[PDB]
Amino acid sequence: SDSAINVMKWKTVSTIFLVVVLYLIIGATVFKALEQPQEISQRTTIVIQREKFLRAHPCVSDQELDELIQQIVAAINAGIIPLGASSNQVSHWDLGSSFFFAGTVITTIGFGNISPRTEGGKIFCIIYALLGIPLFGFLLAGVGDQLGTIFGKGIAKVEDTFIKWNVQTKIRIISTIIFILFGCVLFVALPAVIFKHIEGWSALDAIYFVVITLTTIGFGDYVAGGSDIEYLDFYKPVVWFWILVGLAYFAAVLSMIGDWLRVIAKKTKEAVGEFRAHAAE
Amino acid sequence: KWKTVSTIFLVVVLYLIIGATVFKALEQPQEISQRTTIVIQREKFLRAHPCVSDQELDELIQQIVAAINAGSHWDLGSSFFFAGTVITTIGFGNISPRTEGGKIFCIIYALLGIPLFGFLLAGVGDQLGTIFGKGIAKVEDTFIKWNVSQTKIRIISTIIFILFGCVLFVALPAVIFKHIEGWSALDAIYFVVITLTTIGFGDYVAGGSDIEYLDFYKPVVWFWILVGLAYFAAVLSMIGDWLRVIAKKTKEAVGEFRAHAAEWTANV
Numbered sequence: 001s002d003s004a005i006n007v008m009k010w011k012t013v014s015t016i017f018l019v020v021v022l023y024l025i026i027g028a029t030v031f032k033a034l035e036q037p038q039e040i041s042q043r044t045t046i047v048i049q050r051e052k053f054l055r056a057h058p059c060v061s062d063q064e065l066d067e068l069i070q071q072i073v074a075a076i077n078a079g080i081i082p083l084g085a086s087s088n089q090v091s092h093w094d095l096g097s098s099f100f101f102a103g104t105v106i107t108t109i110g111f112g113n114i115s116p117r118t119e120g121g122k123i124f125c126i127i128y129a130l131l132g133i134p135l136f137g138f139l140l141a142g143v144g145d146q147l148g149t150i151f152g153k154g155i156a157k158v159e160d161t162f163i164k165w166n167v168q169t170k171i172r173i174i175s176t177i178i179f180i181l182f183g184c185v186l187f188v189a190l191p192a193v194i195f196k197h198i199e200g201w202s203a204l205d206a207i208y209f210v211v212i213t214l215t216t217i218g219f220g221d222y223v224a225g226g227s228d229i230e231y232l233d234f235y236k237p238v239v240w241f242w243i244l245v246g247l248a249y250f251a252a253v254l255s256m257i258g259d260w261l262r263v264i265a266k267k268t269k270e271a272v273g274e275f276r277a278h279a280a281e
Numbered sequence: 282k283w284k285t286v287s288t289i290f291l292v293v294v295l296y297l298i299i300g301a302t303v304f305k306a307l308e309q310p311q312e313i314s315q316r317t318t319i320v321i322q323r324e325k326f327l328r329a330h331p332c333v334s335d336q337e338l339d340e341l342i343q344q345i346v347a348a349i350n351a352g353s354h355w356d357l358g359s360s361f362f363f364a365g366t367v368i369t370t371i372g373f374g375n376i377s378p379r380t381e382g383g384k385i386f387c388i389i390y391a392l393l394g395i396p397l398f399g400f401l402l403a404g405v406g407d408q409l410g411t412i413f414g415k416g417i418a419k420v421e422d423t424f425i426k427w428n429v430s431q432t433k434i435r436i437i438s439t440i441i442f443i444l445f446g447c448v449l450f451v452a453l454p455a456v457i458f459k460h461i462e463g464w465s466a467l468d469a470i471y472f473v474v475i476t477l478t479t480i481g482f483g484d485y486v487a488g489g490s491d492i493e494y495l496d497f498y499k500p501v502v503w504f505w506i507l508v509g510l511a512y513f514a515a516v517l518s519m520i521g522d523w524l525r526v527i528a529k530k531t532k533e534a535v536g537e538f539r540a541h542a543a544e545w546t547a548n549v
C-alpha cells in the first residue's frame with residue numbers, strides 16, 4: 001500500500017518515457033526529412049560563393065578569409081551593422097530593449113536575439129531569473145484567473161440561450177469550442193495579422209511566431225522587437241502585454257491538450273486490452 | 282470581488298523596469314567597446330588588403346548576412362536533440378526550421394509534444410520527489426530526536442535539498458561541461474541555469490560548437506535535462522513560496538503601520 005503503489009508508479013513513468021523517446025525519434029526523422037534538402041542546397045551554394053570570391057580576388061588572403069568570417073560570426077553574436085555606410089548603429093541595449101529583454105527572462109521565452117555578454121550581466125541574469133521566474137508565474141496565474149473568470153461571465157450568457165428542450169454534459173463540448181474559437185482569434189489570428197502588416201512577415205511566419213512565442217519555446221528566429229524598421233513605440237509595450245495574456249491562453253490550451261492526452265491514453269489503454277483479449281484469441 | 286492582480290502587475294512592471302536599467306548598465310559598456318573595436322577591425326582589413334575595395338567588402342558581408350539564415354546540421358542525432366528543445370520549451374534556437382512544412386510540423390509537434398513532455402516530467406518529478414522522501418526519512422530520525430524541535434527542522438531538511446541538489450544538477454554537470462566544451466567557470470553555471478530554467482537563450486548549447494564531443498555525451502545531456510528540469514521546477518516553486526510568505530509578511534506589516542498611522546490620526 002505504501003510502496004506497493006510506488007511499483008505501479010514506476011511502471012507508469014517508464015512507459016511514458018518510451019512514448020516520449022519514440023516521439024522524439026519520430027520528430028527527429030521528420031525534421032531532417034524536411035530541413036536536410038534545404039540544408040544541402042544552402043551548404044553547396046555557399047562553397048560556390050566562396051570559390052567565386054577566392055578565385056576572382058587572388059590577392060586576398062586566401063586562407064585568412066575564414067579568419068575574417070569567424071570575426072563576423074563573432075560580430076553576429078553581438079548587435080551589429082558592419083558596413084561601409086551606416087557607421088552610426090542603433091542600441092540593442094537601449095532604454096526599451098533591456099525592458100523587453102527582462103520580459104524574455106522572467107517569462108522563460110528567452111528569444112536569445114539579445115543576450116548578456118558581461119560577466120556581471122550573466123550573474124545578474126541568473127539572479128534576475130531565479131527570482132523573476134517565480135515572480136512572473138504569480139502574475140501569469142492572476143491574469144489566468146481573470147481570463148478564466150472573464151470567460152466565465154461571457155459563457156454564462158451563452159450557456160442559457162442554448163437551453164432548449166433536450167439539451168449539461170453535452171453542452172460542455174460547445175462551450176469549450178467557443179473558448180478555442182474566440183481564443184485563436186484574439187490571441188493568435190488578430191496579433192498575427194498585425195505582425196504581418198508591421199514586421200513584413202508572411203502568413204505562416206506570423207502564426208509560427210505566435211505559437212513559438214506563447215508556447216514559451218521562443219527560438220528567436222522571429223522576434224517582434226528584433227529589427228530596426230520603424231517601431232512606433234506604441235508597439236513594443238503592447239507586444240509583451242499581448243504575451244502576458246496570450247501565455248495565459250496557451251497555458252489553458254496546452255493543458256486542455258494534456259487532458260485530451262489523458263483520455264486518449266486511457267482509451268488506447270483499454271483498446272489494447274480489448275484487442276489482446278478477443279479476435280479468436 | 283477584490284482583484285489583487287493589479288498590485289502584482291505593478292510589482293512586476295517595476296521589476297522589469299529595474300531589471301531593464303540594470304541590464305543596459307551592465308551590457309551597454311561592453312556594447313560600445315565591441316562596436317568600436319569592430320570598426321577598427323574593418324579599416325584594418327580595408328587598409329591591409331588593397332586587394333578588396335569598399336564595394337566588394339559589403340557584398341561579402343551581405344552574403345554572410347544571408348548565411349545568418351543558415352549558418353553538419355539536422356543529422357540523425359541533431360534533429361532528435363532539436364525535438365527535445367521543442368517539447369521541453371527550452372528552444373535554444375541554434376537550429377530552427379526554415380521549411381514551410383518544418384514550421385507547420387513544428388507548430389503541431391509543439392502543441393502536442395509540450396503536453397506530452399509535461400507528463401513525463403511530472404512522472405520523473407514524482408520519482409525524485411519520493412526518492413528524496415526516502416533520503417530524508419533517514420535524516421529525520423538520526424538527529425531529530427536530539428536537541429532541535431521539528432518545526433525548526435523543516436529548515437535544515439530543505440537546505441539539504443538545495444545543497445545536495447545544486448551539487449548533482451548544477452555543479453557536477455557544470456564541471457563536466459567546463460572540461461568537455463572548454464567553457465569557463467561561470468559559462469558552465471550560466472548554461473545550466475539558462476537550460477534548466479527553460480529560458481534557453483542558445484548563446485551556450487551543449488550540442489553546438491561541433492568539433493570535440495563523443496556519442497556518449499549527447500544522450501546524457503538531454504537525460505540530465507529531463508531530471509534537472511524537475512529539480513528547478515521545485516526550486517523555482519520553492520522560491521515562489523518564499524515570495525508568497527514575504528508578500529504576506531509585508532502585507533500585514535503595512536497593515537500594522539497603516540493601523541497606528543490612521544489610529545492616531547483619528548484621535549488627533
Ligand SMILES: CCCCCCCCCCCCCCCC
Nearest residue numbers: 203204207208385386388389393
Ligand atoms: C497555415 C498553418 C495551419 C496549421 C494548422 C495546424 C492544425 C493542426 C491540424 C492537425 C490535424 C491532425 C489531428 C490529429 C488528432 C490527434
Ligand SMILES: CCCCCCCCCCCC
Nearest residue numbers: 123126127130466467468470
Ligand atoms: C569562480 C567563478 C564562480 C562563478 C559563480 C558565480 C555564481 C553566482 C550565483 C549567485 C547566486 C546567489
Ligand SMILES: CCCCCCCCCCCC
Nearest residue numbers: 131288292524527528531532
Ligand atoms: C503590498 C504587496 C506587495 C508584495 C510584495 C512582494 C515584493 C517581493 C520583493 C522581493 C525582493 C527580493
Ligand SMILES: CCCCCCCCCC
Nearest residue numbers: 150186187191241242245
Ligand atoms: C474583457 C475581455 C478583455 C479582452 C482583452 C483582449 C486582449 C487582446 C491582447 C492583444
Ligand SMILES: CCCCCCCC
Nearest residue numbers: 019022264268269272
Ligand atoms: C499518442 C500515440 C502514441 C502511439 C504509441 C502507442 C503505444 C501503445
Ligand SMILES: CCCCCCCC
Nearest residue numbers: 292295296299531535
Ligand atoms: C523589488 C522590491 C519591490 C518591493 C515592493 C513593495 C511594495 C509594498
Ligand SMILES: CCCCCCCC
Nearest residue numbers: 440443444445447523
Ligand atoms: C545556496 C544559497 C542560498 C542562500 C539563501 C539566502 C536566504 C536569505
Ligand SMILES: [K+]
Nearest residue numbers: 109216217371
Ligand atoms: K524558451
Ligand SMILES: [K+]
Nearest residue numbers: 111112373374
Ligand atoms: K532561443
Ligand SMILES: [K+]
Nearest residue numbers: 218371372481
Ligand atoms: K528559447
Ligand SMILES: [K+]
Nearest residue numbers: 112374375483
Ligand atoms: K543565435
Ligand SMILES: [K+]
Nearest residue numbers: 108216370479
Ligand atoms: K520555456
Ligand SMILES: [K+]
Nearest residue numbers: 108370478479
Ligand atoms: K516553465
